[PDB]
Ligand binder design. Structure first.
Ligand code: HEC
Ligand code: HEC
Ligand code: HEC
Ligand code: HEC
Ligand code: HEC
Ligand code: HEC
Ligand code: HEC
Ligand code: HEC
Ligand code: HEC
Ligand code: HEC
Ligand code: HEC
Ligand code: HEC
Ligand SMILES: [Fe+3]
Ligand SMILES: [Fe+3]
Ligand SMILES: [Fe+3]
Ligand SMILES: [Fe+3]
Ligand SMILES: [Zn+2]
Ligand SMILES: [Zn+2]
Ligand SMILES: [Zn+2]
Ligand SMILES: [Zn+2]
Ligand SMILES: [Zn+2]
Ligand SMILES: [Zn+2]
Ligand SMILES: [Zn+2]
Ligand SMILES: [Zn+2]
Ligand SMILES: [Zn+2]
Ligand SMILES: [Zn+2]
Ligand SMILES: [Zn+2]
Ligand SMILES: [Zn+2]
Ligand SMILES: [Zn+2]
Ligand SMILES: [Zn+2]
Ligand SMILES: [Zn+2]
Ligand SMILES: [Zn+2]
Ligand SMILES: [Zn+2]
Ligand SMILES: [Zn+2]
Lengths: 106, 106, 106, 106, 106, 106, 106, 106, 106, 106, 106, 106
């Protein structure tokens, strides 16, 4: 998957997460996100095509995915316990990371 | 994944395939369509919910999926061989099986 | 397992599913049922031993089994989500499929 | 494997089946057929190159492989029990499906 | 599975074993009996709930189950060696174990 | 792990189970208790080293551990079914087992 | 393996352990002893065939085997920790178990 | 496991590692510690629940965990080589990392 | 593998990649660099041995590896797609991340 | 598979390879030749049945297979790299090892 | 296992195979023999410790082992087919290979 | 890997072997050699590019790798027992095979 494909995947499964009524739908959504983020953190966004890889921009970009992956895991921790409303809340809090990286680098 | 979830998956991956430039991307997108159609065949569409599980439209519905699952495999055969533009021509040709079921039951 | 033992398995797990009070017992009963039905779909029933493998009755006998596994998958989908009562109700609708085969071929 | 390769495989292992004197030779032959049929049912025969995939010809073609796979499984059921003569008989009965599809579509 | 479910499972496979005509079928019945006796040994029978788990009754009840699992393993030993009649005679013999626990705690 | 390590492990997970608010957390605590009780049953307590392994003390010490592993398995049965409160009441009950062995060999 | 085969296996690995000069070799000998003692505990010795499986003799015979498997597990514990001499002294000690059952049922 | 239970696990295995006399106990303690720290790196500590997921404190909290797993990997590297005392000494240096996090965030 | 062992691995595989003529060779060499960098991130370089595990140079060191591990994944993404000369241009570009860390800490 | 069974396999797959247009087909055919030659090396040809297992013709026979198994691996190396016409030139060159053994022992 | 223990294993399983009454005991004895012979083919016998690794005697010693595994594979091939007496007779021919090595090198 | 790549691998790990101070470093080095030799024995050296594959040169070349693989296994046998000095000695003795094949065919 390219970068855009993986963003589309995270976004879709985020929508599945809010629509869900049970923990298994949520669990499986989060796992697909977890795979899209893993495939994506090594990508280079078009806005950073002329930075060296070592620049603080590109390492802040990598930092955004690791923070994203951290809270995806936190949401999965809740889902695997059956706490559907608490997982949906945790998944909502994930958008702060989404937006922060979008403001700077998208 | 409910039925429309998996319909959305099929649609997204049709779009990934038409724009790809390698067989790896195409292969993986096909594999996801395979997963989606397997989760979808045992579902009752809304417009068929009041007709018996034996009825010929329920048989004709689940027959449509195995025809789809067939041509996905066929396309997947071409992609596993590196034949990327023929795997893409087979994915383009998947739409007439999509339309046929849609005209009848969507 | 022979055909008669698979049928007795299918029937055992309907009682299990109906008396169940949690989703784990239901998913496991529905999993054994999928096992018994997979093994039984290739069998030859006493009253069709007379007949050709490509006869209409044998093609229909087999096709009645593809529809039972279908509905068993749908009910497993609910049970995996923790919806025990929806799972119970979907399994009770399965007896439409048992009856339609029995009338023709038992 | 192309379609012809897989037909050659089924035919060879069918010959191995009649030559056999033990259940393991038979079991392993049937398993190779089972894989050739799986690889083959999504193929398009030259005689159906101009039918749409949804036509009753192509779905009857798919139907022939599923009936074939059903009795391969039945033969394997016998072989895995040690019943060598009964498996060889079941494997012989498979030729009806072979011939029926050959008459129409080969 | 509760205790009663696993008892019915033991019963069913005793019948399956007596009518079997090959070793594969007895082995699988013995395998399922083993899985049943393993889930059941830690359960509490209705007539021993009013009692501490370290009482000799709970100890003798668990003792009966390990006696049963040994006789199933011995029978499974013979079945894995193709001795259908010997394993069948062994399965019949362990009825003496089922009965011993029954006129005690059932 | 020595015997003392596994005792501390048993103790920790009893506390974890009493404060849990979901089934996933009790199941894992029970799973770890099982792994602990399995490593510990073949150990020799300090007050039974001066003794042959076939003495009734070593036999009753090992007897206590199999009593414990049964009660953990019964509790694990309820937890796997989502019955958090029942499994929690079951975990509390097996404290009677921990104490019985303790005022004997500790 | 019959009972006698597994006895010879126990004997061989006792000798292998006494002459070993490292932990890997004792661990594997203890592992094979474990596999031997597991296959053997459900067998019936020649001098206890004239007897019901719930007699104290069959119960004490099976009791001896669980005593043995515990001492092998304790020795395996030390070997996995690299304590060759301690595991070697532990293997020698369980000769007292082999002898106890022998002047009883052999 | 919650954050507090993972911390109690991390602390348990430091005592295990310090009192250990072989490399197998150390590698296994260090493996449990890696488990507890992996599960805890995505948690939210009481005193930061107030705060944004992309706040400096949460980014720092997470980053303090990447350094603890790092050092735990290094100590596992030694323990896997059988260097128990070097492994013990590397683990005792781990408390620099525990302290630096506790001062800021406990 | 100590730190210089894994540095040597990275260097050798950089040379394999520049001279390869297929993506399989490049893919596998990249996978080995992945393994090497995973074993290397948790190591303390000599010139940093006296600075605290918290120090910003230790953080800046282990940050450098994840930047390297990132671009290896990125190159590995291109190789898995068959893009051999672009996977090689990405491996050529890996050197500026090598130099950057070397100028600072080698 | 008896010896002539596996000879037939080798022959069929030589023909698949010469006509293929991709490395996937060639790879899989080579993998099947690998399986066939592994099953075939430990067989005694008819014209060598009365010569001792030590005899130099039995040694020279089983030496011929490892020479064949070698060049199959070598061809398989080229196919795994995508070099389809060089993998096919190596498969064409396999025949001189076939002929050499045939002239001597067929 | 050392060379002498592997030989004692090889000899143990010949007696097992000769006294066996079913194909399962034979296949399992022949499997242990293949294990012992695989581990022993790289050993150095007492009377060749004097000698070079590329000496004619060591090359011959090793080559005598490739022929023993060969014949053990052939006998396993029969035992896997349920031909216990043919398997027994093929194993009794194995002692030609044991003798030829012993005369030269024991 | 080409032939030269694999020779470089064996040589590197041989250097790691003499530098090592523990059995795990040695074990892992030998395993990487074992894989390089496996990948290499089917190769054709430049000096034998004009020999037929069946010539005694090319089969002596294959013979050199099998002797090499035999002693790599012997060294691994020692390493897996913890005998580091004895494994380093066995690994040193391997150079005779290296040199012998280098004199003739390199
Ligand atoms: C940086 C660390 C990011 C994080 C965290 C997330 N996204 Fe993102 N996103 C990012 C970039 C650099 C881009 C631009 C890609 C490009 O090719 O220009 C995007 C884009 C998207 C899109 C648009 C997809 C498309 O069709 O082009 C979507 C739908 C999207 N992003 C969604 C999304 C969600 C839901 C996230 C959190 C769960 C998220 N992104 C995080 C960079 C980063
Ligand atoms: C029957 C055998 C079908 C085949 C083959 C395909 N689709 Fe489908 N589709 C089907 C139904 C019954 C429905 C309605 C489902 C509902 O719950 O209302 C759909 C719907 C879609 C949608 C929209 C989903 C939504 O927004 O609710 C899409 C985008 C879609 N289908 C796409 C699609 C594609 C791309 C297919 C083949 C490649 C395809 N469908 C096949 C039934 C069937
Ligand atoms: C055909 C496609 C069938 C479907 C679907 C189901 N059943 Fe069936 N069943 C079928 C036949 C032809 C027979 C008779 C076979 C014979 O040898 O007589 C049966 C038998 C049963 C039985 C009695 C079995 C016995 O112990 O003798 C039962 C209890 C039974 N079947 C139950 C059952 C249930 C609950 C089903 C749906 C879940 C079901 N069957 C489906 C053919 C077919
Ligand atoms: C349809 C559902 C089929 C079934 C069932 C079987 N076969 Fe078939 N076969 C089929 C077709 C459409 C063709 C023509 C392929 C082509 O490229 O034109 C064939 C051909 C064969 C062949 C010839 C192989 C060749 O070298 O071209 C053989 C040997 C063959 N088929 C054998 C065979 C056997 C043994 C079957 C049952 C076990 C069998 N076929 C089933 C279609 C179908
Ligand atoms: C104790 C050590 C037992 C052994 C060994 C066997 N059985 Fe059992 N059985 C036992 C109890 C305590 C009960 C009552 C459980 C309850 O909840 O009431 C039973 C019951 C049965 C039943 C009746 C189930 C029903 O739904 O009516 C059957 C059919 C049964 N048991 C069968 C059975 C078989 C076949 C056994 C040996 C193979 C066997 N039991 C052993 C206690 C014990
Ligand atoms: C015997 C059959 C026992 C059972 C069941 C349980 N315990 Fe145990 N316990 C036992 C002994 C012989 C000892 C002494 C071991 C020694 O080496 O001295 C113990 C000790 C404990 C301890 C103290 C550990 C410490 O480091 O001080 C604890 C906390 C403990 N045991 C807990 C415990 C729990 C929670 C149990 C049930 C779930 C349990 N024990 C059962 C013997 C036996
Ligand atoms: C019962 C609880 C036993 C334990 C523990 C051990 N042995 Fe055993 N042994 C037992 C019996 C009933 C028999 C007779 C079996 C028969 O079929 O006659 C034996 C026999 C042996 C033998 C002789 C085998 C032969 O072929 O002659 C040996 C060498 C032997 N046993 C060894 C052995 C060892 C080494 C044990 C402990 C590690 C051991 N036995 C324990 C009963 C029991
Ligand atoms: C942050 C990155 C931390 C690291 C690294 C370590 N600890 Fe920690 N720990 C942290 C917090 C924020 C807290 C308090 C959480 C709360 O809910 O109050 C803790 C707590 C502990 C405790 C007490 C746990 C309890 O049972 O209440 C202990 C014993 C503890 N921590 C130990 C510990 C050790 C040994 C560490 C290094 C190996 C370590 N912690 C690292 C935050 C962080
Ligand atoms: C830090 C984040 C580094 C990155 C990225 C790379 N290297 Fe490295 N390298 C680093 C250090 C601290 C050292 C010194 C280690 C020591 O123990 O002294 C090295 C050393 C090397 C060496 C020589 C090793 C030796 O002979 O002792 C080589 C050949 C080397 N490094 C190569 C190399 C390559 C090819 C890299 C990227 C592709 C690379 N290094 C990255 C620290 C870091
Ligand atoms: C010895 C080292 C051999 C090598 C290399 C190959 N073959 Fe072989 N082949 C060999 C023998 C001893 C026999 C006779 C077996 C018998 O039981 O009579 C054969 C036979 C064949 C056959 C015909 C089999 C039959 O119909 O009975 C074929 C088609 C064949 N061989 C093909 C073949 C190919 C294609 C090879 C390399 C690619 C090859 N053989 C190698 C011995 C040896
Ligand atoms: C060389 C290639 C051999 C083959 C093939 C077989 N044996 Fe062997 N064996 C060989 C040697 C060099 C030795 C002596 C090693 C020593 O340290 O003295 C042996 C030894 C035995 C023994 C005695 C083992 C002992 O306990 O001391 C036995 C019982 C034995 N060998 C049996 C045996 C059998 C049955 C074989 C064929 C299946 C066989 N050996 C093959 C060398 C070789
Ligand atoms: C034949 C059976 C060989 C054995 C055993 C070993 N090596 Fe070798 N080596 C061999 C050949 C034919 C060649 C030439 C390759 C070429 O392309 O010309 C080599 C070469 C090497 C090299 C040089 C690598 C390079 O950069 O070209 C090295 C470092 C090497 N060989 C090392 C080596 C070691 C350490 C061995 C034993 C463990 C060993 N070789 C065995 C053939 C054979
Ligand atoms: Fe139909
Ligand atoms: Fe008792
Ligand atoms: Fe940072
Ligand atoms: Fe030779
Ligand atoms: Zn991707
Ligand atoms: Zn989408
Ligand atoms: Zn779904
Ligand atoms: Zn069956
Ligand atoms: Zn029943
Ligand atoms: Zn194919
Ligand atoms: Zn053929
Ligand atoms: Zn249960
Ligand atoms: Zn332990
Ligand atoms: Zn046995
Ligand atoms: Zn957790
Ligand atoms: Zn604790
Ligand atoms: Zn390392
Ligand atoms: Zn074969
Ligand atoms: Zn060994
Ligand atoms: Zn022996
Ligand atoms: Zn290679
Ligand atoms: Zn190198």
């Amino acid at each position: 998957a390219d970068l855009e494909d993986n963003m589309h995947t995270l976004n879709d499964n985020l929508k599945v997460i809010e629509k869900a009524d049970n923990a298994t739908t949520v669990k499986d959504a989060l796992t697909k996100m977890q795979a899209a983020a893993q495939d994506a953190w090594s990508a280079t966004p078009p806005k950073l095509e002329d930075k060296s890889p070592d620049s603080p921009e590109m390492s802040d970009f990598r930092c955004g995915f690791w923070e994203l992956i951290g809270q995806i895991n936190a949401a999965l921790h809740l889902a695997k316990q059956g706490k559907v409303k608490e997982a949906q809340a945790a998944a909502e809090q994930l958008k702060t990371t989404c937006n922060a990286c979008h403001q700077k680098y998208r």
